């Protein structure tokens, strides 16, 4: 007979251990707190109760592995603007990108 | 027994500040809004 009204639950069943946290290869696409980026190892010193780390503006660029110690700093996936260089469809139809 | 003692009133100086959250930060100057012990306030020095 389950109990769920009062001070937060004790019993529950999260997953665990997807894999080998997946330092580089912009794959390590979550950690504890949901993140989506290139996620690998770092060299920070998280004050061993502190777990994740913001930058100057509230974006978490560091996290510690839960099951291990592993201060992993995260970095966003990649992006930019594909700009297309063309001689002009009157001259030719080849483009550099 | 009743081993009791005295009182006082002291100026709680620049201290009483705790990491308000479990978030790491580096070389930032955060601007929180938590519940702190306001600087240079009065503490009641119980003996």
């Amino acid at each position: 007979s389950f109990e769920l009204l009062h001070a937060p639950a004790t019993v529950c069943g999260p997953k665990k251990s997807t894999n080998l946290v997946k330092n580089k290869c912009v794959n390590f696409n979550f950690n504890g707190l949901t993140g989506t980026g290139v996620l690998t190892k770092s060299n920070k010193k998280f004050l061993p109760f502190q777990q994740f780390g913001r930058d100057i503006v509230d974006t978490t660029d560091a996290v510690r592995d839960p099951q291990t110690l592993e201060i992993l700093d995260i970095t966003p996936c990649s992006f930019g603007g594909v700009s297309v260089i063309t001689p002009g469809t009157n001259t030719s139809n080849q483009v550099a990108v | 027994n009743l081993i009791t003692t005295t009182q006082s009133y002291t100026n709680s100086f620049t201290r009483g500040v705790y990491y308000p959250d479990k978030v790491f930060r580096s070389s930032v100057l955060h601007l929180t809004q938590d519940l702190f012990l306001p600087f240079f306030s009065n503490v009641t020095w119980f003996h």
Binding site: - | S12, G16, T44
Partner: peptide, 28 residues
């Protein structure tokens, strides 16, 4: 200057209003 790193949460939905020591003692 010294900061006070957390020790524990103890999720306790209880309503406190008083306290006191037993066996210094600057309540702020």
């Amino acid at each position: 200057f010294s900061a006070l790193e957390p020790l524990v949460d103890l999720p306790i939905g209880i309503n406190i209003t008083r306290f006191q020591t037993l066996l210094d003692y600057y309540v702020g």
